[PDB]
Design a protein around this nucleic acid. Structure first.
Ligand SMILES: [Mg+2]
Ligand SMILES: [Mg+2]
Ligand SMILES: [Mg+2]
Ligand SMILES: [Mg+2]
Ligand SMILES: [Mg+2]
Ligand SMILES: [Mg+2]
Ligand SMILES: [Mg+2]
Ligand SMILES: [Mg+2]
Ligand SMILES: [Mg+2]
Ligand SMILES: [Mg+2]
Ligand SMILES: [Mg+2]
Ligand SMILES: [Mg+2]
Ligand SMILES: [Mg+2]
Ligand SMILES: [Zn+2]
Lengths: 206, 155, 92, 60, 118, 25
RNA sequence: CAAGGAGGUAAAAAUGAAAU
RNA sequence: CGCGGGGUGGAGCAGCCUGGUAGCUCGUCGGGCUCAUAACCCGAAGGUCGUCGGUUCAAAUCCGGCCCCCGCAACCA
RNA sequence: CCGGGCACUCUAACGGGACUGCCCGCGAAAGCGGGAGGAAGGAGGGGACGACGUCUGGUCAGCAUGGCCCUUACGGCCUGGGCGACACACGUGCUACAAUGCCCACUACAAAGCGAUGCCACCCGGCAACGGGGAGCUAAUCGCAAAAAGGUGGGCCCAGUUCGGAUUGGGGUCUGCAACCCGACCCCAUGAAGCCGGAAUCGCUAGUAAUCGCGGAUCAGCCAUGCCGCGGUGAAUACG
């Protein structure tokens, strides 16, 4: 097969970055490690929110962090916890301006990371994968999508024989640059191994 | 499968002469892409022609090429695991290329010491019809001569 | 008698008793075939049903190959009562 | 030897020449870029992710 | 002119003719004729006998050369005879002294290939 | 003589400088 | 201007490979 | 046991007679061709001449003594 | 170099710029040939982009991970050794066998990049590696660098030779806790094999092949002749 990451393939035109800060040497290395440890720490105790993105911006001790979520149900009104020390526990190895925002991803059926994550949950629920794929695609296609494509590969339904389940409706042109194609991926942990879920969501451009 | 007939490459005319031929000769002299050393050697040898003979090198070089031109050459062709050698005519493009190539090669075959004197002498010998290149030309025509049997295979 | 090893795992298993070169469930299997290839005075003795013995072909001519399990082969050269170039190879 | 080996890579005492680079995301000791502090493998992953500020595909 | 142990080089530049002695090379060559004060580009063909005498007297003395220093060099290798080091064993086995690659190459000390086959 | 350590040409190829190739002027 | 039927037909080039 | 012929590289054969050179095919070893083998092509290495004596400046060669191999002979009673 | 100016060159940001749109011919169309049109053309030249799938391809030694196995040990620390071993065989290469060549001196003309826990101008010692100093540079400012092939001059004169540089002796320098096994240079002396390659076998169709040097990553140092880039000069030939 061999195909390039549809995110990296854009980056410049279509699909901007995810960590937008500028530094020269002697700083880039340290600030990138911290940046990645933020992404690592957030992903853990915020998965129940199902986060589509983790945007990060900086400006000398400013560190802004925008968490996109389908349902920000785990924020609960100011002093109702789930934010207070939670956005303050970041500065236990940072000590800088931990400005943590929360975004409301409107339609989760149009967010590739969320789609793949919903599918990967279902694999671990011991669902029928082929039927799960079909539904998720139509579900994405039901919410106004111009094209969709989900891919689960390896060890399907347990059973000693790595497979690859494939389904895709509408239009998904990966080669085109003016594409606006959202890509998501998820690890499904099973008692019989590990399988990967790709999810492609496409909308118009020009 | 040569869909395009590969158009003939055209060159830049030289200095002082305007030749549409001399530059092609300088190119064969050229090794490793040093046209400076190449052109110098030829013009050097042109100065050498003036000494041993009172002739303008533009004709001495011209006639030499004309004397080292293969009228017909031998071509290995078809049927029998490519067993035959049909003697074919030579295109003006190919006579051109062979003349200059054999000249330079025979020139560097000579026992002389300087590249210029080899070029100059081999040109003077070839202008007369004596050069080692003329040997090569006459040799290639012998082969083409001895194969007139199945020449009617032609093509 | 075995005289040479081309596989480091097998070599350690027979020499030092190091079983960390082979599959854990195939330690007893690999041991009893190696000992049988060692006590073998002629290739005819390595002819028990469970080994599925047979000389190889082509560029692997001169080589033999008893079966350990699955698609796994103990390939060697048997000459003058000795085996050489003992290799634990997948038949591919 | 992998866990106790990514320990030494950060421990860095005893003679200055015994200290060496080491990918942080992984534990790779080879092809470790000083600029990112990452191996060539990890660096490619994150560059496609978009988590590498400014880092962009090279076409010319 | 029988300068040191040799005489051979005739009509061929004294700075070059000198080279034809085990011990002279190229640096000691011009160094010897600038210190003796003789024109390097000379004929070597038995020129001014005086220049030749001075040259001979300086060159043949000063530093060790020819058969004498060959003996010293061979003796420096004989140093690692006795109960010598590792470097001696490399002179013993006939293998390269400076620890290089011997898996291939090293033909200049091993000699031409012998081919075992098996 | 790109491999002879006693030429301006070999010293180029090797990179390093010296007596047979001074650091300019 | 559009072929139906009749005939001279390549050479030198052998083998299989190691669980279903 | 009576005559004749023969023992030479791993195999089969020359060279002996007209003493000073041991050569041929196959095989072996290296390298190529092929996905691979065979075939093919390139390049190599390899012989106490059965053995014990003698002649001679010099022995595969000429002369003896044994040691095997093969072939002829063994008739008249 | 200043005053001053920024039209040239350059820098980098958006744009314009050919779509065979226009002419002749062919054709039912698509299209094809040809021609002024211009820097450019009938996808301009190169990049990034790799369909359904194939190879039980590769990768448990980047990483994640199901199963099996090891736990006073198949884990952990340390000094030392080894990965660098060499009778041989193959792959990819570097340097050559020379005179369109070698050596010395002088003198030009690049691009793309890297550097203030470094690049290090200019002086001083030193044959040199290099060491003492020490200015400028958070760098289209200072430095790495003079690009090299080229040119001009002069010397060898075709001989294993001023070709070729292996191998070896000695003397040094620098990094490093330390360089025996196993580091790179510098200097003295040795100067080998090779005089152009058997059967076979590779690359490239235009800035291309060939040839010349320059940068970078990794990196204390370096076994880099490698890899990834940069420009300099610049062929031959394509009937088929
Ligand atoms: Mg070594
Ligand atoms: Mg070889
Ligand atoms: Mg058969
Ligand atoms: Mg063979
Ligand atoms: Mg074959
Ligand atoms: Mg009778
Ligand atoms: Mg495309
Ligand atoms: Mg496999
Ligand atoms: Mg693992
Ligand atoms: Mg190794
Ligand atoms: Mg020789
Ligand atoms: Mg010669
Ligand atoms: Mg092409
Ligand atoms: Zn890593």
């Amino acid at each position: 097969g061999n195909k390039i990451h549809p995110i990296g393939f854009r980056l410049g035109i279509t699909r901007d970055w995810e960590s937008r800060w500028y530094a020269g040497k002697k700083q880039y290395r340290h600030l990138l490690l911290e940046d990645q440890r933020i992404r690592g720490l957030l992903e853990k105790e915020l998965y129940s929110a199902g986060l589509a993105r983790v945007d990060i911006e900086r400006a000398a001790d400013n560190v802004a962090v925008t968490v996109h979520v389908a349902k920000p149900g785990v924020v609960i009104g100011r002093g109702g916890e789930r934010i207070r020390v939670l956005r303050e526990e970041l500065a236990k190895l940072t000590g800088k301006n931990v400005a943590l925002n929360v975004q409301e991803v409107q339609n989760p059926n149009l967010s590739a990371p969320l789609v793949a994550q919903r599918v990967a949950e279902q694999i671990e629920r011991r669902f029928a994968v082929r039927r799960a794929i079909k539904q998720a695609v139509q579900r994405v296609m039901e919410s106004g999508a111009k094209g969709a494509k989900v891919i689960v590969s390896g060890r399907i339904g347990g059973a000693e024989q790595a497979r690859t389940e494939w389904a895709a409706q509408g239009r998904v042109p990966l080669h085109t640059l003016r594409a606006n194609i959202d890509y998501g991926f998820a690890l499904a942990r099973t008692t019989y191994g590990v399988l990967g879920v790709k999810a492609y969501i496409f909308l118009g451009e020009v | 499968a040569r869909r395009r007939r590969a158009e003939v490459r055209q060159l830049q005319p030289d200095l002082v002469y305007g030749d549409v031929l001399v530059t092609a000769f300088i190119n064969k002299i050229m090794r490793d892409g040093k046209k400076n050393l190449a052109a110098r050697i030829f013009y050097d040898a042109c100065k050498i022609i003036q000494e041993k003979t009172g002739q303008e090198p533009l004709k001495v070089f011209k006639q030499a090429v004309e004397n080292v031109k293969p009228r017909m050459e031998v071509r290995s062709r078809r049927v029998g695991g490519a067993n035959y050698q049909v003697p074919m005519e030579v295109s003006p493009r190919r006579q051109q290329s062979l003349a200059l190539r054999w000249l330079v090669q025979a020139a560097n075959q000579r026992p002389e010491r300087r590249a210029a004197v080899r070029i100059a002498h081999e040109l003077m010998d070839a202008a007369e019809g004596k050069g080692g290149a003329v040997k090569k030309k006459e040799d290639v025509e012998r082969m083409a001569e001895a194969n007139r049997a199945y020449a009617h295979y032609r093509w | 008698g075995i005289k040479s090893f081309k596989h480091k795992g097998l070599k350690l298993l027979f020499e030092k008793g190091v079983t960390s070169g082979v599959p854990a469930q195939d330690v007893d299997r690999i041991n009893d075939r190696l000992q049988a290839i060692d006590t073998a005075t002629e290739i005819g003795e390595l002819n028990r049903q469970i080994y599925k013995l047979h000389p190889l072909k082509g560029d692997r001519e001169g080589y033999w190959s008893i079966t350990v399990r699955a698609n796994w082969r103990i390939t060697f050269q048997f000459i003058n009562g000795d085996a050489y170039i003992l290799n634990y190879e997948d038949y591919h | 030897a992998r866990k106790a080996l990514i320990e030494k890579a950060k421990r860095t005492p005893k003679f200055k020449v015994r200290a060496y680079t080491r990918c942080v995301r992984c534990g790779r000791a080879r092809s470790v870029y000083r600029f990112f502090g990452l191996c060539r493998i990890c660096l490619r992953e994150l560059a496609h992710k978009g988590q590498l500020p400014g880092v962009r595909k090279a076409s010319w | 002119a029988r300068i040191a142990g040799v005489e051979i080089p005739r009509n061929k530049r004294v700075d070059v003719a000198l080279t034809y002695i085990y011990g002279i090379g190229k640096a000691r060559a011009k160094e010897a004729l600038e210190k003796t004060g003789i024109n390097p580009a000379t004929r070597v063909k038995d020129l001014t006998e005086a220049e030749v005498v001075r040259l001979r007297e300086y060159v043949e003395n000063t530093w060790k050369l020819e058969g004498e220093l060959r003996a010293e060099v061979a003796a420096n290798i004989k140093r690692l005879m006795d109960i010598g080091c590792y470097r001696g064993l490399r002179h013993r086995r006939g293998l390269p002294v400076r620890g290089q690659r011997t898996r291939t190459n090293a033909r200049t000390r091993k000699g031409p290939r012998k081919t075992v086959a098996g | 003589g790109k491999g002879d350590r006693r030429t301006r040409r070999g010293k180029i190829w090797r990179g390093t400088y010296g007596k047979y190739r001074p650091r300019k002027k």
